[PDB]
Design a protein around this ligand. Sequence first.
Ligand SMILES: [Mg+2]
Ligand SMILES: [Mg+2]
Ligand SMILES: [Mg+2]
Ligand SMILES: [Mg+2]
Ligand SMILES: [Mg+2]
Lengths: 178, 79, 114
Amino acid sequence: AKLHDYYKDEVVKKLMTEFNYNSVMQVPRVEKITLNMGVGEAIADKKLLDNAAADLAAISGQKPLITKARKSVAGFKIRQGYPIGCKVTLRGERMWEFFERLITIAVPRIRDFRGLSAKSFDGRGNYSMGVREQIIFPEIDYDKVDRVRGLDITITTTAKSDEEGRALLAAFDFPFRK
Amino acid sequence: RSLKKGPFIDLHLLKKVEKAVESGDKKPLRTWSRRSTIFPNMIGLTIAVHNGRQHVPVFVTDEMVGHKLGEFAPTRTYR
Amino acid sequence: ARIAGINIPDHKHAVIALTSIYGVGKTRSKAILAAAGIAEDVKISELSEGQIDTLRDEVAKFVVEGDLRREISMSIKRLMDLGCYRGLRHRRGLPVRGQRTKTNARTRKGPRKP
RNA sequence: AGGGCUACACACGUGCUACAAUGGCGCAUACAAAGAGAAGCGACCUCGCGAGAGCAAGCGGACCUCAUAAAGUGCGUCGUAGUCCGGAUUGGAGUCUGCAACUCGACUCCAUGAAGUCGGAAUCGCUAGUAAUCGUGGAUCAGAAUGCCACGGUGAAUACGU
RNA sequence: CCUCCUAAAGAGUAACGGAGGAGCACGAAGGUUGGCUAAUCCUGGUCGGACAUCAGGAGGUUAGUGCAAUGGCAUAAGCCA
Ligand SMILES: [Mg+2]
Ligand SMILES: [Mg+2]
Ligand SMILES: [Mg+2]
Ligand SMILES: [Mg+2]
Ligand SMILES: [Mg+2]
């Protein structure tokens, strides 16, 4: 709950005066990170998926959830089954703990990072940005790793507006860019 | 661009371009001194460079300075 | 060791190995050694800890790997997006060093396109 | 005056440099010929990573300069690798020649480091100081030689026979 | 042999009338228990673009149904174990 505590403590009140919320039971909270890493391709290789799995299971403290195919009529092709990735949401503790390894050891463990997006927001107020490339962070033998990677990450906060979505995250150590 | 020390240009464009500096931007600048380097004074000015055929509407730009007014006007026609 | 990133030359002499670092040649590599305090015959791999530590630390000066291959393409664009003969050449797969196109240019354009 | 003769999707002839270990790279270091030069050759020393710049001697030349030949020899490294092979390409920054280096000069520095692993059918030259290989000078010329003309080092193989 | 119209709001009814299918398929695609719910679009997201997977919103049987058509299906007759 490292960052978790920081929320209720530093954060919250910070928003309670910057947003003048009536009840503490309103201040936008952190509603699980989602992750994904759509392996796509698969089809032929298929192994790049199981690899992406562990490569994912490494990041997330839980177990990868290999997805299937909804349409099964993909322009490319793809059938009903045809695995394409593994979301793997985050769970409170591990979630915030991940919010730690990230923002402090993820975005920080840059590649050429010089500012994070500020439009990764949504309507109800939910930010979700793709790393564009797994920063090779604490993975099985950083160097002795699988060919590239790259994946996505969604926060999905309990905010009612992206505007308020800015306070949250920014209330923490979200690198961003201003 | 090797010219050791001394950005060379033709006197013509100079006396003419300088007038533009004060009189302000306006009509182009019928010039053949395509071998002259661009200066920040003519920055974003209305110039004209020959190329065997006729002249072309050349306009100076920020970084577009240390170059010659000619390396912006292609000569040979290719398909 | 990563040294500057990925690139992990081993066995080969420190000099000839360091060159593997995307962005340095016999010159930059041969100097970085002495400047850091490393011999030439010394095998980067056999080297002791510090004998590899200083390397990274000192090579941090000159630009390498990504940044290089990165900005290097930016300079190519600066003129392309500009519209000068130079850039114009690239967007046409033709030599800029002012070579002959009617003949010999396979390295620029590529193999025959009959 | 500017541009074009340096255009490029192609094909053909003539060449240069490679594919490496009979080699590359480092250091040390031996032997040559023939030529050029007052609007030239230009040392010495100074600065510069270098091209080159400053100052300025000598020589119209068996006096001076261009000019400290390369292969080679010694030692060491490399370890058969697309590899310390090979260098095209390109990017950044510069020197110099001339009013003038965009189009279109030569070169220097750092970086980049492709094709290429000895090449089909077919085809070329060469019978000895020749071939092969390695360097050197000159003409033209402000400044653009892998071309041309010329010089010497090292130095083969094979020829029954028509 | 099956489905719809003709068929006049019960059944049923003709034509060389208008349309389309069957001659099978599943030891699970059956039984049961437990659980789940689409299509489509909008916004935001590595490689993801018209559309692969992820997130949120709108939407509401427009999805799905082993194979025609009609009827039916959310207490699902749809989906998973
Ligand atoms: Mg000609
Ligand atoms: Mg001469
Ligand atoms: Mg000459
Ligand atoms: Mg009836
Ligand atoms: Mg009736």
